[PDB]
């Protein structure tokens, strides 16, 4: 999507995967706020908004 | 999160909201995720 | 309210004992009152601020 329509979407009832997104590292950029950016990611969320 | 709280109740009285206490049991949560900023009330009629 | 004395005496002890424990789940400036959610929120570097 375009900037000012930022899409949103839901990620629910589904288990997840973070650390393909780490292992991955061709993300230029994969800077975390809040929650750790050394694999501590895979907590038990109510909530993922992408 | 869209919460929707629900009880029901008997009533025998006539008007003007009679009183009472009753906590409110949780009955859905829906994760919308959306904006909601104005609400009609919907109401059925009957024809004979 | 005889024995007021040693009722007050206790109360002031439980007050003393209920408030610490209140303390105890306080964020005192922290991201959350849980130290372990830090711990797994938080790489050891950051974690330890």
Redesign the interface.
Do not use: G, K, V
């Given at each position: 999507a375009s900037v000012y329509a930022w899409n949103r979407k839901r990620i629910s009832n589904c288990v997840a995967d973070y650390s393909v997104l780490y292992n991955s590292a061709s993300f230029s950029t994969f800077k975390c706020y809040g929650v750790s950016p050394t694999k501590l990611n895979d907590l038990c969320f109510t909530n993922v908004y992408a | 999160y869209f919460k929707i709280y629900s009880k029901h109740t008997p009533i025998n009285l006539v008007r003007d909201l009679p009183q009472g206490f009753s906590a409110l049991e949780p009955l859905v949560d829906l994760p919308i995720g959306i904006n909601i900023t104005r609400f009609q009330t919907l109401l059925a009629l009957h024809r004979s | 309210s005889p024995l007021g004395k040693l009722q007050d005496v206790v109360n002031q002890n439980a007050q003393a004992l209920n408030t610490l424990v209140k303390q105890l789940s306080s964020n005192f400036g922290a991201?959350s009152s849980v130290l372990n959610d830090i711990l797994?929120?938080?790489?050891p570097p950051?974690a330890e601020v």
């Open positions: - | - | 991201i797994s929120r938080l790489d950051e």
